Design brief:
Two copies of one chain form a homodimer.
Chain A (H helix, E strand, L loop, with lengths): L2 E2 L2 H21 L5 E7 L3 H17 L2 E7 L5 H13 L5 E4 L9 H7 L11 H9 L7 H12 L8 E5 L6 H8 L7 E5 L6 H5 L4 E4 L17 E4 L2 E4 L2 E4 L11 E3 L6 H18 L1
Parallel strand pairs in A: 1-11, 2-3, 2-4, 5-6, 5-7, 7-8, 8-11
Antiparallel strand pairs in A: 9-10
Helix pairs in contact in A: 1-9, 2-9, 6-7, 6-9
Catalytic activity (chains A, B): (6R)-5,10-methylene-5,6,7,8-tetrahydrofolate + NADP(+) = (6R)-5,10-methenyltetrahydrofolate + NADPH; (6R)-5,10-methenyltetrahydrofolate + H2O = (6R)-10-formyltetrahydrofolate + H(+)
InterPro entries (chains A, B): Aminoacid_DH-like_N_sf, NAD(P)-bd_dom_sf, THF_DH/CycHdrlase, THF_DH/CycHdrlase_cat_dom, THF_DH/CycHdrlase_NAD-bd_dom
GO biological process, one term (chains A, B): L-histidine biosynthetic process
Chain lengths: ~280, ~280
């Protein structure tokens, strides 16, 4: 059956590399720092931000937190953004979503300096990705490409089918895989797609990032194909990925969910931060 | 033979709508204005800019000309960009390329305020397209989609094969087609694509935008499919398009080049400006 694409082991590898690279930056006079802006008290948001800072501590990146109440004014939000933008120990940062409804989410996200965009989701950087201007790249597409390369899976000339068009994964992933430096042929699929299986059956690589429980089945996959399980949805039976377990019987490689791309997403947030410090 | 996807009656429709919308803008004291920055002595550029301003006059958009000599400094170019950015009479503008080679073209384009980006090619606007934020859109992709729709060619659920990844055409086109407001399946192909004919033969719509003379031949197109011809290459025999004349025999629809998408591309520059003014 399929070879497991071990994301935790791959993440651990990256972490070891980052620790050395952070030690180097420490030695060079500037320890990198990741900032977070967290507004309000959503349990999941708090958990997500805690996790990012936990990861930071493991590799020696300083945690900078701006924890703000749910009832801050837009002026207060803007001041925080402007401070982190100007803070020399904040090498990059993220704004945890969702924001209180009284706050204009997109205006806040656009106010972030693209030069400190650790998530690689600032519209300016996403547009630079479209245009081929080197700039921060989004973490999940980065981790996907890395995981594939780590196992010597060809992407140049590959036919890749991406299922899903989320702005943090599927959408930017299509732009990433079609650059010259990657060079895949990419079929972009989603819920509007007719006869998904006819397309997935053609793919050397399928990336399932659509959030539909066990949507991709063995009957839909080319024997020996690489299958990347990214999407997660909430079921009566828990969180569940986009890939049916029967795929393991015919695919060449499968990344599990959990334990596949997820750890790599966090590894590339940290990588983005170290790279920004190294660019300097 | 195939039905010609002639763009002129559709351009005329757009111009009628825009003239009305501009009259509504004038009534509200918000007469839109298009600026152009033309640097130096390239005759083609001079004609292009004349054409844009003639189009403006047809729908009632004010023309703002910034004509600069070839030997300007970066500071002079910067002052001009800064001036148009701050000029209240200027709703949007374009920097006519190519610039003299001592000038940094990408720095100039990024210095353009995206709120005045009439081309829809500023990275922050292309990033907004990725993210789903309303903003100026690149004109050729908008033209392609509108031309198809006006000829009652289905977009939703269509399998579109896009050949080419130019940053102003094929690349943003993949993003546009894949919005829920379009909802097409898109295979992104390029010079790196193996077995192109196997892929193009599956398409309900083929977009030829690679700049490779007559790359798309009849054997490559499903009978009754729609073919959009955008790509042009310099031969000698002169300029030649991506689509072999033989595809007219069995395709359902083919756009001529010139005369197909072109008039709409030109009209959508004006639409961008009007939209900027309306969104205000």
């Amino acid at each position: 059956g399929a070879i497991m694409l071990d994301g935790k082991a791959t993440r651990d590898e990256i972490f070891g590399d980052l620790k050395q690279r952070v030690a180097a930056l420490d030695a060079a006079g500037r320890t990198p720092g990741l900032g977070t802006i967290l507004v309000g008290d959503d349990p999941g948001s708090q958990a997500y931000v805690r996790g990012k800072h936990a990861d930071c501590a493991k590799v020696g990146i300083t945690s900078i937190r701006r924890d703000l109440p749910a009832d801050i004014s837009t002026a207060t939000l803007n001041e925080t953004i402007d401070e982190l933008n100007a803070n020399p120990d904040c090498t990059g940062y993220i704004v945890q979503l969702p924001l209180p409804k009284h706050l204009d989410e997109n205006a806040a996200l656009e106010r972030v300096d693209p030069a400190k965009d650790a998530d690689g989701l600032h519209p300016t950087n996403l547009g630079r990705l479209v245009l081929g201007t080197p700039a921060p790249l989004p973490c999940t597409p980065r981790g996907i490409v890395h995981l594939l390369r780590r196992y010597d899976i060809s992407i140049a000339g590959a036919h890749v089918v991406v299922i899903g068009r989320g702005v943090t994964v599927g959408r930017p992933l299509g732009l990433l895989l079609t650059r010259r430096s990657e060079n895949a042929t990419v079929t972009l699929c989603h819920t509007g797609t007719r006869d998904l299986p006819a397309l997935t059956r053609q793919a050397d690589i399928v990336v399932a990032a659509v959030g539909v429980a066990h949507l991709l089945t063995a009957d839909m996959v080319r024997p020996g194909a690489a299958v990347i399980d990214v999407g997660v949805s909430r079921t009566d039976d828990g969180l569940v990925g986009d890939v049916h377990p029967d795929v393991w019987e015919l695919a060449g490689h499968v990344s599990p969910n959990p334990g596949g791309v997820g750890p790599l997403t966090r590894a590339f947030l940290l990588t983005n931060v170290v790279e920004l410090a190294e660019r300097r």
